Design a protein around this ligand. Structure first.
Ligand SMILES: [Zn+2]
Ligand SMILES: [Zn+2]
Lengths: 97, 50, 50, 158, 50, 49
């Protein structure tokens, strides 16, 4: 059922990057292993996931526009997804300006 | 035959290929045999020696 | 099938008793019966003297 | 396909404003983008206007707030204004200088217009395999949230 | 089967009485009956003199 | 369906009264064409709603 209904995604697993400053605790902004995010990612894994309610969530602010959209995902069996794990959907292209 | 099924196509759902005319000819030749047995007749010309 | 606010339901002519082309085949059998009655009137009854 | 076409009247110290909202379902295989604009030429909406008329507005013409498609009623303190005494060009209203110290009141119709404010379902998907040589990915209809073009008003595309 | 509001549902041609291929077998039996009638007209009735 | 289910009403159409003060923008409270409301009304129309 899940393999029929889900879209193909690339799953890559989060971990904290060891570039964090030992005093301030913040990421190095020049780190190549993580591009200023505190979180590094393991090599991608192919999986299928079913996704719903794919909202854009436009916000218009004094700083400029931002997207805060949200979606609901149902995983495959026997997986332990972890916080800030990242998914990309290569089939689906979004317009931006 | 296809004229009597105007607006239908017979098509393999796994490939989209239409059914080959060889099957139509095969079925027609057997249908002629059936017609020649439902009625006690010889339809297609042939030389008979009795 | 219901997915993300799109819903579809289909009932087909297939069923546990009848195949999808049952109706057409039945009508064709009626036509065949009429044609055969006519042709068995055109050709006669077979007879032999013992 | 459009639903829930609400006007959303607001009454404010600055004046009235429309903030109405609607829900739109697109055609297949389209990627609508933020602040994309729609107009519905079949559908005409009623609006009201009033202007004080002065020598400048006589010479230059009143720039109308709405994109007037047509006038349904026009009047002044002296009564109805007849069609020989007014003209609209380029969404400007020109009046006979007879009315150099009058106020004119109008009822108008204009085409319905929307801008894409947010996208409630920006992606829906299906791999279709049945009767295909190989699986084909298809993008199902998007759901749009549409907001009415009251604040900044632009001409129709033609 | 339903998961997280995605719903999938099947009624199949199987049933507590009829097997999945019931209709096709019934049609095949009709065709067999016609063919056998024709062929049992082509070959004659068996007979012997006591 | 609407003619069966609706009640008979008199409908009259709004427009801004031309009595509005050209400076303050507010209605004249003594206006006979509109009794202090800023909105004048056209002659009534019979409809069902
Ligand atoms: Zn790092
Ligand atoms: Zn008044």
């Amino acid at each position: 059922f899940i393999n029929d209904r889900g879209i193909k995604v690339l799953w890559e697993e989060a971990y904290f990057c060891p570039c964090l400053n030992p005093d301030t605790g913040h990421p190095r902004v020049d780190c190549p292993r993580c591009h200023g995010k505190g979180i590094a990612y393991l090599p991608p894994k192919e999986t299928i996931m079913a996704i719903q309610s794919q909202e854009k969530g436009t916000n218009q602010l004094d700083i400029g526009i931002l997207d805060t959209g949200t979606a609901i995902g149902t995983t495959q069996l026997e997986k332990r997804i972890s916080y800030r794990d990242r998914f990309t959907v290569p089939e689906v292209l979004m317009p931006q300006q | 035959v296809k004229a009597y099924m105007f607006g239908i196509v017979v098509q393999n759902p796994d490939t989209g290929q239409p059914m080959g005319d060889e099957f139509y000819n095969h079925i027609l030749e057997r249908a002629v045999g059936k017609a020649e047995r439902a009625l006690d007749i010889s339809i297609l010309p042939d030389t008979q020696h009795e | 099938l219901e997915v993300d606010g799109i819903t579809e339901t289909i009932g087909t002519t297939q069923s546990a008793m009848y195949g999808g082309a049952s109706a057409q085949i039945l009508q064709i059998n009626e036509d065949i019966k009429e044609l055969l009655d006519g042709l068995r009137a055109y050709f006669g009854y077979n007879m032999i003297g013992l | 396909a459009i639903q829930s076409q609400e006007k959303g009247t607001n009454q404010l110290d600055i004046g009235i404003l429309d903030t109405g909202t609607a829900i739109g379902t697109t055609q297949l295989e389209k990627r609508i983008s933020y602040r994309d604009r729609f107009t519905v030429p079949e559908v005409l909406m009623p609006q009201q206007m009033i202007y004080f008329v002065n020598k400048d507005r006589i010479k230059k013409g009143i720039p109308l707030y709405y994109d007037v498609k047509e006038i349904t009623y026009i009047a002044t303190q002296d009564g109805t204004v007849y069609e020989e005494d007014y003209e609209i060009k380029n969404n400007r209203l020109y009046l006979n200088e007879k009315y150099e110290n009058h106020t004119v009141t109008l009822k108008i119709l204009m085409t319905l217009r929307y801008v894409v404010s947010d996208i409630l379902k920006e992606s829906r998907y299906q791999y279709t395999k049945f009767n295909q040589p190989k699986s084909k990915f298809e993008n199902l209809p998007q759901k749009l949230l549409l907001k009415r073009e009251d604040v900044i008003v632009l001409q129709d595309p033609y």
